[PDB]
């Protein structure tokens, strides 16, 4: 759309919040990371939305970066869908966390939080595990909706890119 | 500054990030909440940045809402500073969580995670507690930097408001 100033600034903000949610989602939480973290999507996807904020500065070089940011939004929206399912239906992609993050949490996992000893179902230990799992499910679904936000705004730009050219 | 389109959109995005970080920070995590959550700052502060996005639509009624959003940014930046200190130097403001959130986490606290039984310092239970405390410290400091972002942009508007009028 014509609103290239407004839309470019929205993209920079979506990029910065992906970076923030990514670094937040990299806070040590155990043996396994989300795929989003392991692919580094919030870093490389994040800076791509900052870069397509290049349409704040008013060539098909912009079409290249818009298309890359559209691919980033699509893949981020798929990756965060996958991690929500990975947490809540089965741990089907066991993406081992980066070992400098595992150094702080080497003995915990959040992809299962049922205790093997049933007396511990009441325990505070179990309630802590479900708290982290719920926070990760929250951060991933916040990241999903802002990844979906990017997809809408970039598609509404690349649509005008090709119909202009 | 003149960039009222760009700056208003930035404020709406800051508002949506606060609402998202707020709801995320309200995910059940035990007996005590951050002051930010108890004051509901990310909700009422969040919508105030959406409302001062009224300068997207180009009267001193806007000066009223800008000034309220500036007060919201200042108080949010103070409140998130307080909660970081509340977590990491002493639990000096014991803001009891809303009881419908405590219903899911009635037996855990993240403002202390040293176990009373020293054998448990190695335990996974202890590592879960420090994980949640680190996530809260992360979410609060992400919320602080975006609250500080608002303060800069609103001050750079209210400055022009009074020097225009």
């Amino acid at each position: 759309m014509r609103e290239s100033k407004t839309l470019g600034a929205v993209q920079i903000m979506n990029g910065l919040f992906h970076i923030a949610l990514g670094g937040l989602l990299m806070i040590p939480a155990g043996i396994y990371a989300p795929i989003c973290v392991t692919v580094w999507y919030p870093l490389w996807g994040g800076i791509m939305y900052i870069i397509s904020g290049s349409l704040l500065a008013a060539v098909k070089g912009k079409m290249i970066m818009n298309s890359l940011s559209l691919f980033a939004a699509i893949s981020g929206m798929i990756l965060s869908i996958m991690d929500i399912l990975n947490i809540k239906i089965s741990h089907f992609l066991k993406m081992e966390s980066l070992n400098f993050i595992r150094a702080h949490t080497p003995y915990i996992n959040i992809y299962n939080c049922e205790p093997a000893n049933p007396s511990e179902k009441n325990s505070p230990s179990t309630q802590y595990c479900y708290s982290i799992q719920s926070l990760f499910l929250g951060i991933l679904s916040v990241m999903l909706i802002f990844a979906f936000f990017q997809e809408l705004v970039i598609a509404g730009i690349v649509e005008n890119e090709w119909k202009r050219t | 500054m003149r960039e009222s389109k760009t700056l208003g959109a930035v404020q709406i995005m800051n508002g949506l990030f606060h609402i998202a970080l707020g709801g995320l920070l309200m995910i059940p995590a035990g007996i005590y909440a951050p002051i930010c959550v108890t004051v509901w700052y990310p909700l009422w502060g969040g919508i105030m940045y959406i409302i001062s996005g009224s300068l997207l639509a180009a009267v001193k009624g806007k000066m009223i809402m800008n000034s309220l959003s500036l007060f919201a940014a200042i108080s949010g930046m103070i409140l998130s500073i307080m909660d970081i200190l509340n977590i990491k130097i002493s639990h000096f403001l014991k803001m009891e969580s809303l009881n419908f959130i405590r219903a899911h986490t009635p037996y855990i606290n993240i403002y202390n995670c040293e176990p009373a039984n020293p054998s448990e310092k190695n335990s996974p239970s202890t590592q879960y507690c420090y994980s949640i405390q680190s996530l809260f410290l992360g979410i609060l400091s992400v919320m602080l930097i975006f609250a500080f972002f608002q303060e800069l942009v609103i001050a750079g508007i209210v400055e022009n408001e009074w020097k225009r009028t």
Partner: antibody
Amino acid sequence: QVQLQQPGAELVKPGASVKMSCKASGYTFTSYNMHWVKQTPGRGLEWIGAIYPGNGDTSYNQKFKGKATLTADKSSSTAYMQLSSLTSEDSAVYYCARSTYYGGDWYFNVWGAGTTVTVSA
Amino acid sequence: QIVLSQSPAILSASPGEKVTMTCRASSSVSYIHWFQQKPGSSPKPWIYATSNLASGVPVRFSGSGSGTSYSLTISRVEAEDAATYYCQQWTSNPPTFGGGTKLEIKR
């Protein structure tokens, strides 16, 4: 003193079911988790699941969650495991074992003698 | 769900020989437990929480390790030490045993 007694052998038809038992003695039966462990020469020791006889909570190994069904009687102080739909691959020694928490971790500190189940026509 | 890998699968040790067997976890675990089984009997607890000998285990045995790498070592094997030794972990649900190491008397 502390002892878990099991029937030493069970012979059961394929497709049938068996309800082996584990008589606890010498300790407060309701104060400890009772665990069941399978052993087969081709797979080693597989943990099946546990019951807390105090309330009645169970947890199960996912690869057993419909094969076994744990139970406990507070009064006779006996744990039970029922295996459904028995096949050749259910022929094993089955141990009950009592887990304490001790030295800063869980610990299978006492074991039954084991029940040898043979599933045969 | 953590896989415990034991090496060697058979350890042949001459009486009085110092020997070591190792347990390697597919992920780091807070502690390893060791059980001794002789044929026709249930697994006796042998070492708990990495290094504590169970009641009546000869101080001839010791255990050590951390993270993903653990071991049990015998300062001198007796003829009575011939058995299969299983490592076990509690750090993840379900708890899992190793494949065992059969200790054999070398002659």
